[PDB]
């Protein structure tokens, strides 16, 4: 299990979503949508809580992510 780092705060919109704070070390349990329930969301663990969170909210080492395509809403 690789441990990624949170780039931003994330406030959950439900009980299945994992709250993130910038700097959190996140243990990534599954990058697969068959587990997370949604493309682009991963399953992980922080502080003994497990839940899903957005994959664009973490980076391998906590520095800026690889330069490339953004997300629309």
H/E topology pattern: EEHEEE
Intertermini distance: 30 Å
Instruction: Let me know the number of strands.
Output: 5
| Widest beta sheet: strand line-up | 4-3-2-1-5
Alpha-beta classification: mainly beta
The portion of residues assigned to helices is: under 10%
* Principal-axes shape call: globular
Number of helices: 1
Count of domain modules:
1
Major beta-sheet overview? 5 strands, antiparallel
**What is the percentage of strand-forming residues?**
25-35%
Rg from C-alpha positions? Answer: 11 Å
Question: How are the SSEs placed, and which strands pair?
Answer:
Elements: E1 3-6, E2 25-30, H1 33-36, E3 41-46, E4 49-54, E5 58-59
Antiparallel strand pairs: 1-2, 1-5, 2-3, 3-4
PDB class: transferase
Keywords: Huntington, peptide fusion, mixed lineage kinase 3, transferase
Assembly: monomeric
3D architecture notes:
It is classed as transferase. The entry lists the keywords Huntington, peptide fusion, mixed lineage kinase 3, transferase. The assembly is monomeric. The entry is titled "The SH3 domain of MLK3 in complex with poly-proline peptide derived from Htt". The protein: Mitogen-activated protein kinase kinase kinase 11, Huntingtin fusion protein. The organism is Homo sapiens. The protein has one helix spanning 33-36; strands spanning 3-6, 25-30, 41-46, 49-54, 58-59. Strands 4-3-2-1-5 form a five-stranded antiparallel sheet. 5% of the residues lie in helices and 33% in strands. It is built from one helix and five strands. 21% of the residues are buried. The protein is mostly beta strands. The chain has one domain. Strand 3 (41-46) and strand 4 form a beta hairpin.
